[PDB]
Amino acid sequence: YDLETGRKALLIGVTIGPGNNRHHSIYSIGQRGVNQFLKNIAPQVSMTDSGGRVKPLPIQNPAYLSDITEVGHYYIYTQDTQNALDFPLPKAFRDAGWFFDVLPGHYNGALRQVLTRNSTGRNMLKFERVIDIFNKKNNGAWNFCPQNAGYWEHIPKSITKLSDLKIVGLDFYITTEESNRFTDFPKDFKGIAGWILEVKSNTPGNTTQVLRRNNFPSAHQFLVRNFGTGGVGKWSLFEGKVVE
Amino acid sequence: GDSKPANPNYLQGFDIKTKELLFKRRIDIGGVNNNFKGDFQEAEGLDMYYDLETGRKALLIGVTIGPGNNRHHSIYSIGQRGVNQFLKNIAPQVSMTD
Amino acid sequence: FFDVLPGHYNGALRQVLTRNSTGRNMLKFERVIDIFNKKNNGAWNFCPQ
Amino acid sequence: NAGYWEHIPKSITKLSDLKIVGLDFYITTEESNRFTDFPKDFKGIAGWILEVKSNTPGNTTQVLRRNNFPSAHQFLVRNFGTGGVGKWSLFEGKVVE
Amino acid sequence: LEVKSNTPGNTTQVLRRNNFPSAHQFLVRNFGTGGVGKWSLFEGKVVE
Amino acid sequence: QEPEFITDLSPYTNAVMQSFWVDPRTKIIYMTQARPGNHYMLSRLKPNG
Amino acid sequence: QEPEFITDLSPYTNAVMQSFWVDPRTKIIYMTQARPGNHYMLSRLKPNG
């Protein structure tokens, strides 16, 4: 019953799709103007707003990104991602902006949350998770998608142990000063020419970290260290034999 | 309109020749039920589209309902019959697939 | 398959490009571009796939 | 990946069917004995992370790295599929402080 | 052949043999801004 | 008369929608939807669903 | 005469829009935002946005 013009429209619900997967809509056999008005009260929820641009956040700076339960693309500025807490990559790592996409999950109350850094010069990086809107306790962890371009990825001097770097697939570069700064390094090789590392997969609570040496003139080596609650170990070098 | 939904906006029309008040109304433009994206109903002006084909004037208003740096830019209209339909059907919104 | 995705409120936009081939790996690349300052566009990241 | 371990089912008694490239699995000591192509000498001594990688069309490379914390680190390699069957090549590391 | 990231210009190239019966080999190099790079080899012990 | 589309709903539940009702003043759709057992759920949805 | 949505705007500027005109002769929008400085910018754009 159109409150304004006194018009009236007859609406009908129809529910289609197979047994589990269902999709239910509202049609009208109503009056002049009313069907149009109802269709145009507010827009259909698309991946982006009408016009090529990111949608806005539903809320101000959110502590918990899981508060966002609207599909579409979004954007998180530096200040907002620094204020947040549910977001991966600790506060010292947080410096840049992040495109925050939200994709539909399933019908029992789930959604996705993809999140790519706005890295221009550095290597962009993507996380993604599944959230449950109602029972936030079931919010799974942020699976990291290895994507790389060729650039390094600094780790700030605030971190003072290689155990903080628990994220898999990443490649942090290390210099001589950094090896001398950190503590967990092999003392025999602590402060020698710098190099890159790489984290690898393992069980929860622990991780195996591989750590290579960069060698233009010299011979190569790469160490490996398994550590965590299940157990802690020392490194195990792998020496190389030069050949031409 | 204020920059927050607590102080409700107002559109007031009135004759210029007589310097009176014909009417004023509150209108919830943007998020329905006063539930905007965050809390920022910063209002914005409005104009009168006159289609040259039919000659039917149509008022249309701009609003922003976006929180913080993220700004939304939504458009509403009080036009007559045949103008809003036409304005939407000029060209379609963007979409990943045609 | 080349798809453009929204960036942020300045002139930014994400790009993704996934090769089309059934008989081989469908590698994908990813980047960001700035429409105004073309020089400010990032490089081509890569996922294994 | 986020730091979890995909279990191997109990309806598989071979390492050859795990042809899923880029994927990692974990084997415990107790379940590292029900296999066949597993190295017999290293059968049931510690935890073993297998990771798969690509090769010629119809061939895959499996890499079994031990997760032993105190002692040295071992990892075995084999490329199998078309032609012959990959032989378990071992690589040992030197414990260093 | 496989590639691993490094400082810009610099990058590591790993190369792994493909032999089923014989011993496995893999040789790694780092080339770019720092220099050309020398291939360091690692050979495996055939075990069962 | 011939029907036509108005809006498709989107309540986060996997079941058969039993009925609905629009509010002409607030334009929320209240959708009543059964659940397995002797219970059901009411859901307030936007005009677009 | 309760309002009706028309369209949504997608300018490349992170500032609150301040005026909004439509061109009946070409169906193009002119949208003026005030930049952080005194200066301002008007974006000309498509009917959809």
Residue found under tokens 């102080």: B7
d(CA A39, CA F6): 5
Q: Is A52 on the interface with C (CB under 8 A)?
A: yes
Query: Which chain D residues are closer than 8 Å to A233 by Cβ?
Result: 68-71
Contacts of B5 (CB under 8 A, 6+ apart): B34, B36, B39, B40, B41
CB-based contact A8:A31 (threshold 8 Å): yes
Query: Which chain A residues are closer than 8 Å to D67 by Cβ?
Result: 202-203, 206, 208, 226
CB pairs under 8 A between C and G: 9
Quote the tokens at residue B87: 């304005």
What phi and psi, each to the nearest 5 degrees, are found at residue A152?
-75, -175
For chain D, how are helix, strand and coil distributed in percent, rounded to 5?
Answer: 0, 35, 65
A52 → closest Cβ in G1, G7, G10: G10
Q: Is E34 on the interface with A (CB under 8 A)?
A: yes
What phi and psi, each to the nearest 5 degrees, are found at residue A195?
-175, -175
CB-based contact A218:E34 (threshold 8 Å): no
Beta strands at E11-16 and E25-31: parallel, antiparallel or unpaired: antiparallel
CB-based contact A225:A234 (threshold 8 Å): yes
d(CA A171, CA A169): 7
d(CA G32, CA A102): 30
Residue found under tokens 């690692």: E42
SS3 state at C38: helix
Instruction: Please name which of A40, A23, C8 lies closest in space to residue G8, comparing C-alpha atoms.
Output: A40
What's the length of chain B?
Answer: 98
Q: Which residue does chain G place closest to A37, by CA atoms?
A: G4
CA distance D43 to chain A (A): 19
Q: Does chain E touch chain B (at least 3 C-beta pairs within 8 Å)? A: no
A188 → closest Cβ in D1, D93, D97: D97
Contact between chains at F49 and A41 (C-beta distance less than 8 A): no
Q: Which residue does chain A place closest to E36, by CA atoms?
A: A216
Give Cα A233 to chain centroid, integer Å.
30
CB-based contact A77:A97 (threshold 8 Å): yes
Q: Which residue does chain E place closest to D38, by CA atoms?
A: E48
Contact between chains at B96 and C9 (C-beta distance less than 8 A): no
Q: Please compute Rg for chain B using Cα positions.
A: 16
d(CA A87, CA A95): 13
> What is the identity of the amino acid at D76?
L
Instruction: Please name which of E10, B55, C43 lies closest in space to residue A213, comparing C-alpha atoms.
Output: E10
Instruction: Please name which of C1, C3, C28 lies closest in space to residue C15, comparing C-alpha atoms.
Output: C3
Q: Is A188 on the interface with G (CB under 8 A)?
A: no
d(CA G41, CA D65): 60
d(CA B31, CA A57): 13
Enumerate neighbours of C (3 or more CB pairs within 8 A).
A, B, G
Residue found under tokens 């084909």: B53
Contacts of A148 (CB under 8 A, 6+ apart): A123, A171, C45, C46, E5
Task: Kindly compute the dihedral angle of the four CA atoms of residues A206, A207, A208, A211, in this order, to the nearest 10 degrees.
Answer: -130
Q: What is the 3-state secondary structure (H, E, C) of chain F?
A: CCCEEEEECCCCCCCCEEEEEECCCCCCEEEEEEECCCEEEEEEECCCC
CA distance G43 to chain B (A): 13
Contact between chains at A240 and E12 (C-beta distance less than 8 A): no
Contact between chains at D70 and A234 (C-beta distance less than 8 A): yes
Q: Is B73 on the interface with G (CB under 8 A)?
A: yes
Instruction: Please name which of C9, C10, C1 lies closest in space to residue C40, comparing C-alpha atoms.
Output: C10
Give Cα D97 to chain centroid, integer Å.
27
Instruction: Please name which of C18, C14, C11, C17 lies closest in space to residue C42, comparing C-alpha atoms.
Output: C14
Biggest CA–CA distance in chain E, Å, is 42
Element (H, E) at E27: strand E25-31
d(CA D79, CA A32): 72
d(CA G11, CA B3): 20
d(CA E30, CA E13): 6
> What is the identity of the amino acid at A57?
L
Instruction: Please name which of B6, E10, A149 lies closest in space to residue C28, comparing C-alpha atoms.
Output: A149
d(CA A9, CA A38): 10
Instruction: Please name which of B61, B38, B34 lies closest in space to residue B48, comparing C-alpha atoms.
Output: B61
Q: Is G8 on the interface with A (CB under 8 A)?
A: yes
Q: Please compute Rg for chain E using Cα positions.
A: 13
E21 → closest Cβ in D61, D76, D84: D84
Q: Is G5 on the interface with A (CB under 8 A)?
A: yes
d(CA D73, CA D69): 8
List, as one string, the DSSP characters of chain G. ---EEEEE---S-SS-EEEEEEETTTTEEEEEEE-SSS-EEEEEE-S--
SS3 state at C40: helix
CB-based contact D34:D15 (threshold 8 Å): no
Contact between chains at C42 and A124 (C-beta distance less than 8 A): yes
Contact between chains at G14 and C8 (C-beta distance less than 8 A): yes
Q: Which residue does chain A place closest to D3, by CA atoms?
A: A204
CB-based contact A14:A22 (threshold 8 Å): no
SS3 state at E1: coil
Query: What are the Cα distances from residue A49, in Å, to A100, C10, F2?
Result: 15, 16, 31
Residues of F with CB under 8 A from a CB of B: 26-28, 46-47
Query: Which chain A residues are closer than 8 Å to G10 by Cβ?
Result: 49-53
Quote the tokens at residue A188: 């025999």
List, as one string, the DSSP characters of chain A. --TTT-----EEEEEES-SSS-EEEEEE---TTHHHHHHTSS----SS-SSSSPPPPSSSS-S-GGG----EEEEE-HHHHHH-SSSSS-TTT--S-EEEEE-B--TTTEEEEEEEE--SSS---EEEEEEESS-GGG----EEE--B-S------TT---TTS---TT---EE-HHHHHH-SSS-GGGTTSS-EEEEE----TTEEEEEEE---SSS--BEEEEEEETTEE--EEE-B-EE--
> What is the identity of the amino acid at A123?
N
Q: Is D28 on the interface with A (CB under 8 A)?
A: no
Q: Is G16 on the interface with A (CB under 8 A)?
A: no
Instruction: Please name which of A201, A209, A200 lies closest in space to residue A227, comparing C-alpha atoms.
Output: A209
Q: What is the 3-state secondary structure (H, E, C) of chain B?
A: CCCCCCCCCCEEECCCCCCCCCEEECCCCCCHHHCCCCCCCEEEEEEEEECCCCCCEEEEEEEECCCCCCCCCEEEECCCCCCHHHHHHCCCCCCCCC
Instruction: Please name which of D94, A155, G5 lies closest in space to residue E42, comparing C-alpha atoms.
Output: D94
CB-based contact C28:C16 (threshold 8 Å): yes
Contacts of D71 (CB under 8 A, 6+ apart): A233, D95
Query: What are the Cα distances from residue G49, in Å, to A44, B6, B19?
Result: 15, 29, 37
Residues in chain B after which the backbone breaks (C–N beyond 2.5 Å)? none
Query: What are the Cα distances from residue B69, in Å, to A48, A67, B29, D32?
Result: 17, 18, 20, 55
Query: How many other C-beta atoms lie within 10 A of the C-beta of residue G7?
Result: 27
For chain C, how are helix, strand and coil distributed in percent, rounded to 5?
Answer: 5, 45, 50
Query: How many other C-beta atoms lie within 10 A of the C-beta of residue C12?
Result: 23
Mutate to test the interface with B, among A4, A49, A60 (most CBs of B within 10 A): A60
Residue found under tokens 């059907």: B89
A39 → closest Cβ in F6, F12, F22: F6
List the resolution, Å: 3.7
What's the length of chain F?
Answer: 49
Quote the tokens at residue A193: 């020419």
Beta strands at D89-92 and E45-46: parallel, antiparallel or unpaired: antiparallel
Query: What are the Cα distances from residue D35, in Å, to D20, D68, D73?
Result: 18, 20, 22
Q: Which residue does chain E place closest to D84, by CA atoms?
A: E20
CB-based contact D62:D54 (threshold 8 Å): no
